[model samples]
Target: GSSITGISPITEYLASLSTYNDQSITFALEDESYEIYVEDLKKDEKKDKVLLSYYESQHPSNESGDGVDGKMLMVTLSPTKDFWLHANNKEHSVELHKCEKPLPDQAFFVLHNMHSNCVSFECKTDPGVFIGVKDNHLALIKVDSSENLCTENILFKLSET
Candidate 1:
């Protein structure tokens, strides 16, 4: 069991994860230098890791609009559906697995901190750990529960509004 320090004592509003269904969201790094995407890893475990990279798809939009959004994530979010990228206990490597049913193991305990307009996704199965980046890849790291306006928590933004 890991104890996260620097947790904000400020009151936080828990937002419905279901609301994410409506938006085309993009998860990018704090510096906005990297974005998250699912890459097919066909190796031993297939990893199916949520990968990070600079948004350089070599695409150019046209007069008619609707350009090459070939790399954008695909999702029709459900109210109680399972989300992506699961982590093993302490290994910290986050991987995505497909399933029709919503499993408790796959769901995240998300917190929307009111004090700072930032967010954190902690696994429901385990209390203290969180989903953040490491080595250009998504990994589970234990940190302050929901403290400051953390740059790591500022990873997501509405996609290409």
Candidate 2:
């Protein structure tokens, strides 16, 4: 019997998804109602593009930031057709996904708690790259500088709907 104790606190445990289930969390921006949404981009028939829109009628109750060391979150797409907001590497954007039936690791995003109760999201697999809002759309952006991240684009405020 030889077992060594692992590093304490160095490895933060992520919270379970059930804690956020049915909570209906909305990640809004510094602006009025420009939150995250998956929509069909102009001139596209089936392609879903994650966007930061002012519209709230796009089923806000279907998503939740379901976290640990920074509260890593997995955005559950919806209840009608269960899915998640996946970090698509190829497309370099957030899209709906279901990889392992119940949970998809690609959808996991670690939090970056900023000032004023504002928080940012970064993919577990995509280190340094955050779920940023650029030009009114959700895309993977690299936070190489503090001011880059300090911008209101990436800052999100969680509120129950």
Candidate 3:
């Protein structure tokens, strides 16, 4: 029988590097009030787009910079409700739901989820959504939520320093 050994340390070291270089942030969907941790994601070369994941826990980190653990929740469109907005981008139908796996080329806006200081990104395809602010809460609204595309619909404060 053939087996591999001493892989744990290598794996741990890799995980440590990832943690040390983590750019994860925390945000909440405007009306939902659910806190979500957003990690700086690399392009899914196979899909050629960024795959955003919603997490229920705080940003995963390891003081030793080796092991990080957490759970991810699915994000989807609200099956029955549909909302439109143009606050931060072009016209879009905003209806978010919790689901497994994201659509290819689905665009997301990364914002400072803290003090509303900085913001960036836009949708590449139709039906694109924006991470926005509504009623003093963080929101994931349709790209059309704002006409100026730079109002309360954009966020900038981050969970990390």
Candidate 4:
């Protein structure tokens, strides 16, 4: 969604497919622009859907950042998670991510709203996967449900820090 300028009740947190099967999902931020839609069903033939996962939390592109804008954070979606963002117009920028593997019926995505001519950051974190940057090197990739196929909740260890 786009609004040319930005800022609204863009708060769409959906995480509860059994609490993300117990992997991790968090949010409760406020500002505007947010979209997280995950759909990879296969139980009783839930529409026979394929892939459609989008996670975008933005805000901050004007202030000598060059480009990009979006914000807000908040999570809690169940009852068959299905969150949605707002705003539209001004050359829309569709969002969805959750990829590193799996690709048959399709279900992989990733995008970290980026722009680096030199350096720019607003939110960033990485220990097991914690990135939420803005107007910086861009960093917003949070899709870990253990590569869910039915409940793959994740856990991959490899540290040196």
Score every model by TM-score.
0.40, 0.49, 0.27, 0.19
User: Which candidate has the highest lDDT of all?
Assistant: 2
- What do the candidate models score in CA lDDT, each in turn? 0.38, 0.44, 0.31, 0.25
**Model 1, runs deviating above 4 Å:** 1-83, 114-116, 146-160
Show how many residue pairs clash in every candidate, following the order shown: 0, 3, 21, 24
**lDDT, candidate 1, 1-161, per-residue tens:** 21222222222222222012222222334442435432332333322122221111122345333654453221122212243355667576555444644333433344334233334455656766666555444566676545634544324322111
> Scored by Cα lDDT, where does model 4 land?
0.25
Those runs of model 4 whose alpha carbons end farther than 4 Å from true positions after fitting are 1-15, 19-58, 64-151, 155-161
lDDT of prediction 2: 0.44
Cα RMSD (Å) between model 3 and the true structure?
17.3
Give the range of the ten consecutive residues with the poorest summed lDDT in model 3.
Answer: 10-19
Model 2 lDDT per residue over 34-116, tens place: 35533322331322222321111111233543222242332333321344467778968765544655343455466666656
RMSD of 4: 17.2
Best-performing candidate as measured by TM-score: 2
* TM-score sort, best first: 2, 1, 3, 4
Taking the tens digit of each residue's C-alpha lDDT, what string does model 3 give over 12-94?
Answer: 01000011122333333466543434355464222111222231212324432333453322222121223211222333323
Query: Judged by lDDT relative to the true structure, which candidate is superior, 2 or 4?
Result: 2
- Candidate 1 vs candidate 2: the lDDT winner is 2
**What local lDDT does model 2 show for residue 134?**
52
Cα RMSD to the true fold for all candidates: 19.3, 14.9, 17.3, 17.2
Candidate 2 ranges with C-alpha deviation above 4 Å: 1-80, 145-147
